[PDB]
Amino acid sequence: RARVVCYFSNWAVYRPGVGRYGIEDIPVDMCTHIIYSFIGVTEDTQQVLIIDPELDVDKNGFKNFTSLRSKHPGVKFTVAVGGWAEGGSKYSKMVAAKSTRMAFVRSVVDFLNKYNFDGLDLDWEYPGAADRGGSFSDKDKFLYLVQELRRAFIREGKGWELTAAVPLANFRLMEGYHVPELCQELDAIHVMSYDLRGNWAGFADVHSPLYKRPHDQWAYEKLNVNDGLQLWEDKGCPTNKLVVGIPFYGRSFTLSSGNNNYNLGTYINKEAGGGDPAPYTNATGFWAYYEICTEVDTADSKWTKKWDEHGKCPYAYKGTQWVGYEDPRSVEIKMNWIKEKGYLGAMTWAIDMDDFQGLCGEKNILIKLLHKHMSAYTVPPPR
Ligand SMILES: N[C@@H]1[C@@H](O)[C@H](O[C@@H]2O[C@H](CO)[C@@H](O[C@@H]3O[C@H](CO)[C@@H](O[C@@H]4O[C@H](CO)[C@@H](O[C@@H]5O[C@H](CO)[C@@H](O)[C@H](O)[C@H]5N)[C@H](O)[C@H]4N)[C@H](O)[C@H]3N)[C@H](O)[C@H]2N)[C@@H](CO)O[C@H]1O
Numbered sequence: 551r552a553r554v555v556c557y558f559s560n561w562a563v564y565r566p567g568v569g570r571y572g573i574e575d576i577p578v579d580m581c582t583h584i585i586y587s588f589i590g591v592t593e594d595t596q597q598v599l600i601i602d603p604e605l606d607v608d609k610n611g612f613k614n615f616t617s618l619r620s621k622h623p624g625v626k627f628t629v630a631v632g633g634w635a636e637g638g639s640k641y642s643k644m645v646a647a648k649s650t651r652m653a654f655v656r657s658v659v660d661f662l663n664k665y666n667f668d669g670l671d672l673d674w675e676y677p678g679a680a681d682r683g684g685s686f687s688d689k690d691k692f693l694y695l696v697q698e699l700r701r702a703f704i705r706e707g708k709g710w711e712l713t714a715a716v717p718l719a720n721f722r723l724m725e726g727y728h729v730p731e732l733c734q735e736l737d738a739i740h741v742m743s744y745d746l747r748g749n750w751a752g753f754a755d756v757h758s759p760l761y762k763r764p765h766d767q768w769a770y771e772k773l774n775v776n777d778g779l780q781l782w783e784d785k786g787c788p789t790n791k792l793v794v795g796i797p798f799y800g801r802s803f804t805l806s807s808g809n810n811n812y813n814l815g816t817y818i819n820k821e822a823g824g825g826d827p828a829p830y831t832n833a834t835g836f837w838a839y840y841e842i843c844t845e846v847d848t849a850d851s852k853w854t855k856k857w858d859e860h861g862k863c864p865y866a867y868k869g870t871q872w873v874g875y876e877d878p879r880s881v882e883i884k885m886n887w888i889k890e891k892g893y894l895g896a897m898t899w900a901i902d903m904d905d906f907q908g909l910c911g912e913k914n915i916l917i918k919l920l921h922k923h924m925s926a927y928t929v930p931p932p933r
């Protein structure tokens with residue numbers, strides 16, 4: 551009764567060579583809930599924005615995805631609205647008034663019917679965030695949107711789910727999330743327990759540490775998966791609504807010139823923007839799990855791999871390049887910890903970055919760990 555929630559990226563199909571990952575590559579039976587990412591919202595009319603219509607509509611991407619339910623009827627196929635690239639200002643604007651929320655709600659309902667989705671995942675990043683076009687009143691108005699969506703979904707009578715992807719930093723919670731009320735209205739809270747460290751922070755570190763490290767201070771002190779999930783609990787979310795995100799990717803850095811200290815917390819060349827882009831994701835500071843294992847785990851690798859003994863994550867470096875990520879050891883630690891805490895399950899950003907080709911070993915190695923642990927686990931009553 552645990553969830554394995556798999557975000558699926560519609561842009562992964564454009565990655566070259568063995569990076570290409572399409573609907574047909576999703577290992578459906580390893581997931582309980584699969585979320586097509588992303589649709590957005592229009593700036594002017596508060597309607598659903600289809601972001602890649604040639605793929606999503608003309609080549610039937612949405613429908614190919616939802617019709618996977620024919621062969622896998624026990625799995626739920628939903629769509630996520632928002633995402634980082636969408637920005638937050640259009641969402642803050644959409645929720646500002648009852649009339650614009652109801653326009654979006656009607657548009658969402660038509661869209662879910664049209665493409666036979668099982669519901670919607672809200673991924674506005676983030677209500678209340680001044681750095682993302684948000685403002686103080688988003689906290690109330692995001693909750694109104696959620697309540698209004700739930701009521702529309704009820705009226706539609708198809709039992710659609712409504713979930714949200716959420717951050718775990720206290721200040722973000724305070725600025726954007728009425729926790730008890732959101733947790734009551736939503737079927738699952740997909741906690742983004744990753745991107746907790748990265749080039750933006752000005753030092754090298756793993757991005758999904760499970761527990762506090764000695765160098766963690768001030769805003770970073772509780773910015774780890776264990777304390778962040780504990781914060782959601784403390785703020786009133788039941789244990790059996792919280793799903794813990796696991797990144798199938800690393801945050802990388804270019805170290806500062808002449809820097810021979812590779813320890814956690816070491817200074818970086820921040821203007822580099824992150825580690826050099828890898829060949830398939832081609833994004834500074836960001837490497838898919840399969841881009842990491844093909845470099846770090848080969849027999850003749852010149853990478854040095856280390857282990858964060860407190861955060862329970864691997865990191866690896868070579869020359870000026872340094873990357874923190876998740877590997878089978880760290881993911882297994884997190885699966886055991888999820889079961890120890892009694893949370894609703896595990897989530898991944900994103901299924902298209904697992905080693906789905908078996909370039910390094912067994913295919914789909916990371917999602918198989920989520921599936922192995924969660925499928926044998928019974929979620930206990932709320933704590
Ligand atoms: N919820 C949080 C997530 O949002 C977050 O992960 C991020 O999500 C965002 C979306 O919100 C991702 O943004 C997408 O990034 C894509 C890849 O960079 C962009 O697509 C590409 O854009 C390129 C420019 O046009 C194109 O590059 C070309 O490639 C060609 C192949 O045809 C090549 O021939 C050519 O020479 C190139 N021009 C490419 O075609 C195209 N697909 C997309 O626009 C963009 N919006 C972001 O990547 C992702 N990291 C997550 C992690 O932070 O946390 C989440 O949970």
Ligand SMILES: *[C@@H]1O[C@H](CO)[C@@H](O)[C@H](O)[C@H]1NC(C)=O
Binds near residue numbers: 574606609610
């Ligand atoms: C949808 O499936 C059809 C039939 O296999 C295929 O031709 C098309 O490429 C698929 N579209 C996408 C976006 O995966």
Ligand SMILES: *[C@@H]1O[C@H](CO)[C@@H](O)[C@H](O)[C@H]1NC(C)=O
Binds near residue numbers: 832
């Ligand atoms: C990789 O992204 C870089 C930097 O954005 C861009 O200049 C280039 O066109 C991309 N290369 C490929 C192969 O997509």
